[PDB]
Design a protein around this nucleic acid. Sequence first.
DNA 1: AGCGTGGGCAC
DNA 2: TGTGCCCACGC
Length: 85
Amino acid sequence: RPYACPVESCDRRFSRSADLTRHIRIHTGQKPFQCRICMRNFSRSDHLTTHIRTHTGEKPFACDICGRKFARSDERKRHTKIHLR
DNA sequence: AGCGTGGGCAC
DNA sequence: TGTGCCCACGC
Ligand SMILES: [Zn+2]
Ligand SMILES: [Zn+2]
Ligand SMILES: [Zn+2]
């Protein structure tokens, strides 16, 4: 990991500089992506997309066992295991 | 549960 | 780099 975060209080190191560039947003407080519905700002475009589903009710991920739908794949993943014994 | 949000990284 | 997934933790 050649790329160290230059912020004094931070000890994170990255394999790729582009990842350090994304990381630095934490320290600069930069949130370039805004939700046009509630005007909230987010650090990443991926997180803005899933956030928008909280407004639209879009839930693309259905449980294979019971059909319950979720906005995110990881939510469905956390859910499916409840069907275990 | 609902969902913010960082880290890894494919493309 | 931008875009956007998986994974994982947190409240
Ligand atoms: Zn840092
Ligand atoms: Zn919003
Ligand atoms: Zn289910």
